[PDB]
Amino acid sequence: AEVNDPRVGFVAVVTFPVDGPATQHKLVELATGGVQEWIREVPGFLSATYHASTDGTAVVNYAQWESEQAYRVNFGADPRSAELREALSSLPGLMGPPKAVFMTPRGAILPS
């Protein structure tokens, strides 16, 4: 969704530490390769965007959710979220567990 859409009530920023750009590429390919097709229809799921850090050390996911409850009930309480975590943790090149930060949009600056 647009980054400043009011429907976005909850965001998770997840950082995955990797051993270099080849693993960055593989990790994004894995994340968008069909393992999480099921998440697209989850009520409250708005988006998951995966980025490669320019220094080659991490893959960052910026995920928008309609609310914390929707995230908790429709993602965290679904066992398929554990399946997803296992999938992404299986990749060679992943150097530590993913780190998450939870947060709510509070202000924005859009273009003129």
Ligand X SMILES: O=C(O)Cc1ccc2c(c1O)C(=O)c1c(O)cccc1C2
54 class by beta-carbon count within 10 Å (0-12 exposed, 13-18 middle, 19+ buried): exposed
Binding mask 19-38 for a second copy (x = CB under 8 A): -----xx--xx-xx---xx-
Of 65-84, which residues contact a second copy (CB under 8 A)? Answer: 68
3-state class (DSSP) for residue 91: coil
Distance in angstroms (rounded) separating the CA atoms of residues 33 and 41: 16
Of 49-68, which residues contact a second copy (CB under 8 A)? Answer: 49-55, 58-60, 62, 64, 68
* Partner touching 71 among a second copy, ligand X, none, CB below 5 to 8 Å by kind: ligand X
Distance in angstroms (rounded) separating the CA atoms of residues 110 and 52: 24
| Shortest reach from residue 79's CB to a second copy, in Å | 18
106 class by beta-carbon count within 10 Å (0-12 exposed, 13-18 middle, 19+ buried): exposed
Q: Which of 17, 26, 39, 70 binds a second copy (CB under 8 A)?
A: 39
- The type of residue at 98 is P
Binding footprint of a second copy on the chain (CB under 8 A):
1-4, 11, 13, 15, 24-25, 28-29, 31-32, 36-37, 39-41, 45-55, 58-60, 62, 64, 68, 101-112
